[PDB]
Design a protein that fits this description.
heterodimer, A: alpha+beta, five-stranded antiparallel β-sheet, 10 strands, globular, B: 20 residues, alpha+beta, elongated, binds the ligand [NH3+]C1(Cc2ccc(Cl)cc2)CCN(c2ncnc3[nH]ccc23)CC1, cAMP-dependent protein kinase inhibitor alpha (chain B), protein kinase binding (chain A)
Chain lengths: 337, 20
């Protein structure tokens, strides 16, 4: 049973959650190659592990910047959660460590680039293409939510395409283990459920709403709620009036009305029958959930691979030195990292 | 067209996370 698979999956998770791995490498073990992306409290770099010659993506977080942005507890969540999970569509954390200045998370390198890049370039995905990605997210959230985790930042910028054309969810910066309700305003404006905007307690249902936004964005090529400033996006979301492209199939529209549902008693994912309302929807009738999980389905798109350590599927970013202070910064705040 | 309006908007690039 999936119930039973997930039961056992939780026992595995809980062991790692209660006794987290810590300090499993050192910066000098890696050669830094190139910046793959950036964010407010740091960057992600392509690196090579000298001892194996394996290439990895190393997220580097400046501890002082994390403190300023009030992301201490969120960063601790991120690392504690990522070291404990195990699912085909979650990027693996290979190593983590810290030094005087920074925290480091060394993860598997996903060479095909961001969904975002391919989506913007190509314009939109066919319904079958979008459905293939959406299925992987459906299974992933089923997994995460069974572990009492809320993910809270679904978007194409953090969905990387692997060499087999399947999705890797990266980034867990807003992921949280919580039974019941939570309150933090976090996420990306276009993907926020109305509950978050309206500053209510929310739960894992915000992830199912975010799935609706993702599917719409993939199939249409633009999100259901856009504007030039975030405040204008929020006004649109809380209306929740959604218009669909004339090219959207009738099933796709019906799935999205039930995901992008302001009414929690009515939002798919949130009902008595849980994820199965989604999995059994007509739009997914052709999806073989076991073959998706097994990675037996032929991907609609396979990214270009010129070689190992190739970054051609990634944009170029300004390179900045990794400076390590001779004085320890913020030791107490990140003691458990 | 909605596509034209999107492409002309300021939010076709990578979108930053927000937090309170
Ligand atoms: N979008 C990213 C960078 C990013 C942007 C914003 C924030 Cl808040 C966090 C990270 C996400 C990780 N990634 C990446 N690329 C390749 N292989 C990987 N393996 C793990 C992560 C990555 C590079 C782009
Ligand atoms: N029982 C499975 C694992 C399995 C069993 C036998 C073989 Cl030969 C291969 C794999 C079948 C796929 N899957 C799964 N299926 C449907 N919904 C899900 N949600 C999370 C995981 C899954 C995870 C368990």
């Amino acid at each position: 049973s999936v119930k039973e698979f997930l039961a056992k999956a939780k026992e595995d998770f809980l062991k790692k959650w209660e006794n987290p791995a810590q300090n499993t490498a050192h910066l000098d073990q890696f050669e830094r190659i190139k910046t793959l992306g950036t964010g407010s409290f740091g960057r992600v770099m392509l690196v090579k592990h000298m001892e194996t010659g394996n290439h990895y993506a190393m997220k580097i977080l400046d501890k002082q910047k994390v403190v300023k942005l009030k992301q201490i507890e969120h960063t601790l969540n991120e690392k504690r959660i990522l070291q404990a999970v195990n699912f085909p569509f979650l990027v693996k954390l290979e190593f983590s460590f810290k030094d005087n200045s920074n925290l480091y998370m060394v993860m598997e390198y996903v060479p095909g680039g961001e969904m975002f890049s391919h989506l913007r370039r190509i314009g939109r995905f066919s319904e079958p293409h979008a459905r293939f990605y959406a299925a992987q997210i459906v299974l992933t959230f089923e997994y995460l939510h069974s572990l009492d985790l809320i993910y809270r930042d679904l978007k194409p910028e953090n969905l990387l395409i692997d060499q087999q054309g399947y999705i890797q969810v990266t980034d867990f910066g807003f992921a949280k283990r919580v039974k019941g309700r939570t309150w933090t305003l976090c996420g990306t404006p276009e993907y926020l459920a109305p509950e978050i905007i309206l500053s209510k307690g929310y739960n894992k249902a915000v992830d199912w709403w975010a799935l609706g936004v993702l599917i719409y964005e993939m199939a249409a090529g633009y999100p259901p709620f856009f504007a030039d400033q975030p405040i204008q996006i929020y006004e649109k979301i809380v209306s929740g009036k959604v218009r669909f492209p004339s090219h959207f199939s009738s099933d796709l529209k019906d799935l999205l009305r039930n995901l992008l549902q302001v009414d929690l008693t009515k939002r798919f994912g949130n009902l008595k029958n849980g994820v199965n309302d989604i999995k059994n929807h007509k739009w997914f009738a052709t999806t073989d959930w076991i073959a998706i999980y097994q990675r037996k389905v032929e991907a609609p798109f396979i990214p270009k691979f010129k070689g190992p350590g190739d970054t051609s599927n990634f944009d170029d970013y300004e390179e900045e030195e990794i400076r390590v202070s001779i004085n320890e910064k913020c030791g107490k705040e990140f003691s458990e990292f | 067209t909605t596509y034209a309006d999107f492409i002309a908007s300021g939010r076709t690039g990578r979108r930053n996370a927000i937090h309170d």
